From a paper:
From an in vitro translation reaction of the MifM stalling construct in B. subtilis lysates, we purified disomes from a sucrose density gradient. A tenfold excess of MutS2 protein was added to the disomes and the reaction was incubated in the presence of AMP-PNP. We observe two major classes of collided disomes: one with only mRNA density in the interribosomal space and another with an additional density next to the mRNA (B and EV3). The latter class also contains additional density next to uS10 on both the stalled and the collided ribosomes. By local refinement of the experimental data and rigid body-fitting of a model of MutS2 generated in Alphafold2, we identified these extra densities as the SMR and KOW domains, respectively. Only one SMR domain is visible, next to the mRNA in the inter-ribosomal space, interacting with both ribosomes. On the stalled ribosome, the SMR domain interacts with uS11 and uS7, as does SmrB; on the collided ribosome, the SMR domain is positioned next to uS3. The two KOW domains bind to ribosome protein uS10 in a manner that is highly similar to the KOW domain of NusG, an E. coli protein involved in transcription-translation coupling. The KOW domain on the collided ribosome is connected to the SMR domain by partial density, consistent with a flexible loop joining them, arguing that these domains derive from the same MutS2 monomer. Here, only in disomes where both ribosomes adopt a non-rotated (or classical) conformation do we find density corresponding to the SMR domain, despite the presence of collided disomes in other states in our dataset.
Numbering used by the authors:
A (entry chain Z): 2 to 273
B (entry chain s): 2 to 91
C (entry chain 2): 1 to 44
Write the structure that this text describes.
RNA sequence: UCUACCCAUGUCCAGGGUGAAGUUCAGGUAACACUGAAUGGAGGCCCGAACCCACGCACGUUGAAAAGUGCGGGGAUGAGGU
RNA sequence: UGAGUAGCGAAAGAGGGGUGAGAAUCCCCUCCACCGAAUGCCUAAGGUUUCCUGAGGAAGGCUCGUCCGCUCAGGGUUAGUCGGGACCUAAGCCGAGGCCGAAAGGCGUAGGCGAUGGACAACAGGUUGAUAUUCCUGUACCACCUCCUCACCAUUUGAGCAAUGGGGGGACGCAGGAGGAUAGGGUAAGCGCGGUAUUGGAUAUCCGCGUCCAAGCAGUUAGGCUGGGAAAUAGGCAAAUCCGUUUCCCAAAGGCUGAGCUGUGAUGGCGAGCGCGAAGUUCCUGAUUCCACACUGCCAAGAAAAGCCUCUAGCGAGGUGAGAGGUGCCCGUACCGCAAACCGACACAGGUAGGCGAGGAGAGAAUCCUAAGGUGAUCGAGAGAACUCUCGUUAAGGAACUCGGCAAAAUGACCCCGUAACUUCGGGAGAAGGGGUGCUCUGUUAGGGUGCAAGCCCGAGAGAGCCGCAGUGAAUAGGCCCAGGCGACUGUUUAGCAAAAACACAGGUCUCUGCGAAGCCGUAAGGCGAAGUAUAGGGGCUGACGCCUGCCCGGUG
């Protein structure tokens, strides 16, 4: 699923890209595009709050249904499309009643297969169930915290979650990175592995490709000046003589946990 | 408003004398007056029929005398093309 | 050798025009003190 | 209104080379590789105008000019210039 | 004071006439010269009368000045179709309600503003001193209205009308390559007009000039784009004939769009040339333009909305269509705009967005000289010293000079031949480095394009000869090689002393964060992150690739 360019120029020396055999078409469907202008890392008052961002190729948003609301209608899918929003490629599925909708394409999905969405759906890849009907030990994705909100938790390419068990009002599912969490039983997740698994195997060769992607370059703090960063200054190349390394805003940035220790959510994380 | 005020004074140049031969007439009109009420004014008060009206306005020329640097009046000049076999004007 | 002043009437009246100064409170103080001073061209 | 960066929307890049990946054909093998022709046209590709930049030298230094000119230079389909 | 000194701001004029009180500087004429992908022609931003005419020369003009971008007195800009408004919306801005905040205020919904975008109907001739798709001329087109005209429908089993509601559209990137057409170009042929010269020669395959016409209307077309029909209907907040979706049947028809081209517009205009006015065709070449973002491929995956069409809800008793007659507002319109009117304090060797942008040779907008066209650029003449600067040559030696081949010199085009170590097999590599290039004839060469031909265009080569010291005879287009650091590379940076080994970079690694993520801005509402979800974000460090990355947790964190 990954092809490597033979090195003709010097930019393309280590230069692999993802071919699009999984992708079945090129034109996006008209009624579901959404306008989307890049903010360029600027706040509502215009100040820059996120570094290293802004200035990519222009993109058009595609509204995609994380909610999986419509229940019981047999949905067929005839496409697989590349979305230039998030790593995964997303698939338009068209319903029996005559309305078309967009879905994250899961692993091993193909054209023409059927999709069910109810709380009585059989568990096949791409289906949607509330967690109470999901059997234990099944790989699942697109989970949400609040019911009716729409899937939030596992959406990136090749990412997965397997249900460790139900125990009542709450269900134990193991998210990605393994830090298991204890969540409502009434939320609707989508069955399977997300269908762009090989995405880490991309090798950006050119810096211009990341510039197309929309990544501004990142400067080290050690080559800063004294005022604008705690590391900067010192002639020659100096090691960071500031005990633990700290961020541009003074917070140390090497392994101290940063979450509000008095939050509400921490009574669900602590299974681990 | 009153039609007897909408056009102020005619202007007598060599160009104007040329156009009265071929039956177009020159007038200086009010600044707020536009292409049409000058037309309705002129057939209301002249008994003439006018085919086409052209309008253009001049801004004041800068002009110097003594040590003061004043500005002359902004003007709006109107051209009225009478129809065939329409009456003439003084 | 592009010099420090390129003229643009639209940007000039947008950033220094009378409506632009009256839109703010601080601009109103600017108008008031200029008028107390007695400037002929009172706003840009 | 200079300049740095960013947002939306336009515009510009005379010309000549190189020849990728695929595709077809010929062999090749049970098949798969593979081998050769044609095709194909990719490149933060090459050479080089407009355009942009400013590497060297000379002059200029009460200058044509409060930062330039002349002779050469670099990029020149891109992280492009405007 | 310097001192009558420096300077008088890139440039080829010269001569005769004329004005004048005064003439290198003003005007007229003849030659010469300069630019000509511009120093030509339009037109932005901007300036605001600098534009034209007639007077004047105190100041401005680096001199003069009879002169003008100066002064004075007049005069000059005409639009239903061009540009912008009464059309739409992006970024952004404002913002009733509201939400926050010691006060001022900040944020923001509905909504509105906001072109650099989308849509949107006139053109080619003439005209003066100044304007011209605006004025005159002829042919048009768009929107709207009805004192009128004819044709048709139904005036509730209703003709007609259609929405601030759905649906389609508008609706889109980049690169490359055919093809089709037209600009444009050659004067090749033919045609017309004028001429045949005095310097040796030339009524002759001789010389100079010209050899065209829209928009609209009717057809046609290179083409591109499209399957069509029927039934049913968990949808598109309400409806469905519209759209969407399944099932059944036919597969090419048909439809959409379409550069251009034919007639007409044209019994008219333009047209070399002395108010009049001839010929006004064919051939070849032929795009940087159009078909057209049409196709193909590519991945970084490529605006909104209203114009426009459709559907019902709805309105509905008079309308629809064609004539005939009428209506059609505001603002801009001069002049300059690579310049002496703009920005640089100046009539400043600088900068200044877009459209067109010819010929010879040429791959070309390079290069040199010219066309159309514009200009001789505002101090001069006259000696031809030192010295400074920009250039051109130098015998012999050739890098000795010099910190350093700095500078300068040398190679340079096209076609053949040939081309190494290393290599990440792409490269290195135009490696190096050789050889040929002019003209004439064999030849309107093989051969090819174009056309039925006639003719026109392109020209691989060889073979005989002719000259020059020299044949890409000028202008302009790599010096090269061998090693070694440093940095993988293209890139970026101290405007105005430092472009580098500095920064970035792809890659790597560590670390935080389970989504009202973390982090950041703000007190806060609000945001960014992100209309994203550990294959994702944030931070630190190192810097392609290859081989590796040892020991110490006593101290600090």
């Amino acid at each position: 699923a990954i092809k490597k360019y033979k090195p003709t120029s010097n930019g393309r020396r280590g230069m692999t890209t993802s071919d699009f055999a999984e992708i079945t078409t090129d034109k996006p469907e008209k009624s579901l595009l959404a306008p989307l202008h890049k903010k360029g890392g600027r706040n509502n008052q215009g100040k820059l709050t996120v570094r290293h961002q802004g200035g990519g190729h222009k993109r058009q948003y595609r509204v995609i249904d994380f909610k999986r609301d419509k229940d019981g209608i047999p949905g067929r899918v005839a496409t697989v499309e590349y979305d230039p929003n998030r790593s995964a490629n997303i698939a338009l599925i068209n319903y029996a009643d005559g309305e078309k909708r967009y879905i994250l394409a899961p692993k091993g999905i193909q054209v023409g297969t059927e999709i069910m969405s109810g709380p009585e759906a059989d568990i096949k890849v791409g289906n949607a169930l509330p967690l109470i009907n999901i059997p234990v030990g099944t790989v699942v994705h697109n989970i949400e915290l609040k019911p009716g909100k729409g899937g939030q938790l596992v959406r990136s390419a090749g990412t997965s979650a397997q249900v460790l068990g139900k125990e009542g009002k709450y269900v134990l599912v193991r998210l990605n990175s393994g830090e298991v969490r204890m969540i409502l039983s009434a939320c609707r997740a989508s069955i399977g592995q997300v269908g762009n698994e090989q995405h880490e195997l991309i090798n950006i060769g050119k810096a211009g490709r990341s510039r197309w992607k929309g990544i501004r370059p990142t400067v080290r703090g050690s080559v800063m000046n004294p005022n604008d960063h705690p590391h900067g200054g010192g002639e020659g190349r100096a090691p960071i003589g500031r005990k633990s390394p700290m961020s541009p805003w003074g917070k140390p940035t090497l392994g101290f946990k940063t979450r509000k220790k008095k939050n509400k959510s921490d009574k669900f994380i602590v299974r681990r | 408003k009153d039609p007897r005020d909408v056009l102020k004074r005619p202007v007598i140049t060599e160009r104007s004398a040329d156009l009265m031969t071929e039956k177009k007439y020159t007038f200086e009109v009010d600044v707020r007056a536009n292409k049409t009420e000058v037309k309705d004014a002129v057939e209301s008060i002249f008994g003439v029929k006018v085919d086409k009206v052209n309008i253009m306005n001049y801004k004041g020329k800068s002009k110097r005398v003594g040590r003061y640097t004043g500005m002359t009046s902004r003007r709006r000049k109107a051209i009225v093309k009478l129809t065939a076999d329409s009456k003439e004007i003084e | 050798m592009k010099r420090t002043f390129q003229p643009n009437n639209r940007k000039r009246s947008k950033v220094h025009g009378f409506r632009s100064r009256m839109s703010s409170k601080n601009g109103r103080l600017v108008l008031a003190r200029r008028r107390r001073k007695g400037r002929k061209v009172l706003s840009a």
